[PDB]
């Protein structure tokens with residue numbers, strides 16, 4: 249462990265989190281990242297993964313929700329992420345829920361949020377990506393892809409049409425798109441929706457045609473997961489992001505704010521996510537790439553998700569407590585563990601628990 253990792257985790261982040269409300273802290277983080285104001289890990293070949301029609305120089309991505317409006321993409325690559333996912337972006341601008349809407353549970357290394365899809369909207373984000381479109385084309389070619397998580401407006405009558413709007417507007421600027429699914433006449437509704445998203449995707453010109461992934465929560469029933477796996481295979485959905493935050497409250501949470509409404513992220517989600525990855529990988533016969541997310545704050549965490557079936561991983565909440573150096577830390581620890589377990593690279597470890 250580096251000097252920076254320890255200073256940030258032991259001193260700087262606790263101090264900053266004690267001086268700032270959580271929403272301000274997140275806002276500040278976006279502004280510092282967008283300005284490239286970052287502590288200074290060369291990515292080995294062993295971290296490279298090929299999936300989703302793309303080289304990923306390393307398999308550690310930034311999860312959706314950090315950079316909701318696509319303001320900090322370049323700084324997120326500078327921070328050392330192998331890929332960046334922006335959003336969720338809704339079609340029209342919207343404010344999201346009233347404040348306060350994000351909460352730290354430092355004793356649990358957890359966050360609860362109820363942002364409510366606060367979004368600048370498609371049009372603002374489209375112009376923002378357009379301004380750096382060619383810079384991104386070089387980044388993607390260099391193994392640093394961009395994802396866009398697409399949302400729906402609060403008062404949308406037609407969810408499918410909102411996502412279709414997102415495909416049309418941001419699909420041409422993305423390497424991959426993500427649509428968040430909640431509980432599924434439910435399987436048929438999901439089919440109808442994903443059909444429409446794929447049809448819209450397929451209507452884009454070849455060079456501007458993104459992969460489509462479905463992101464799930466960890467709170468689905470067995471039946472919901474079976475149905476999602478079935479639909480995903482039937483329709484040729486390109487991948488799964490496993491998982492979003494949980495509405496559960498695992499026994500053992502200590503933070504005072506544990507009973508705040510919202511999604512819980514960070515360490516208490518970790519194993520629930522991993523086991524979701526495991527089930528989705530088995531239900532799709534290892535044929536659907538999975539991006540694994542939820543409580544990754546170490547190499548071990550990352551490797552457990554990979555071995556359970558993830559091709560790639562994302563983290564977000566760990567940044568709250570470790571700051572930017574966590575990115576280098578996870579990569580360094582993952583590489584070391586890959587070597588200790590006999591894997592030539594990340595690719596060999598994907599789904600290794602199932603074999």
Ligand SMILES: CCN(CCO)C(=O)Nc1cc(O[C@@H](C)C(F)(F)F)c(C(=O)Nc2c(F)cccc2Cl)cc1F
Nearest residue numbers: 264270273274276277280281285359565567568571572
């Ligand atoms: C719960 C509130 N949430 C959102 C969930 O995570 C939050 O607090 N998040 C959160 C904060 C961060 O830092 C707050 C303290 C800052 F910005 F005020 F220092 C950073 C972070 O990486 N900061 C950072 C940076 F961008 C560039 C250079 C140095 C630093 Cl230290 C990331 C985060 F995800």
Ligand SMILES: Cc1cc2nc3c(=O)[nH]c(=O)nc-3n(C[C@H](O)[C@H](O)[C@H](O)COP(=O)(O)O)c2cc1C
Nearest residue numbers: 311312313335336361492513514542543563564565
């Ligand atoms: C403050 C906050 C905002 C989030 N916003 C989004 C979002 O807009 N769309 C989305 O798909 N996921 C969102 N997430 C979920 C993350 O993408 C991720 O799935 C979840 O936090 C689990 O990963 P983590 O434990 O590493 O944070 C958000 C998470 C947090 C903590």
Ligand SMILES: O=C(O)c1cc(=O)[nH]c(=O)[nH]1
Nearest residue numbers: 362363364365366493511
């Ligand atoms: O904006 C939010 O509230 C949000 C969206 C999402 O997909 N996940 C989450 O935890 N929060």
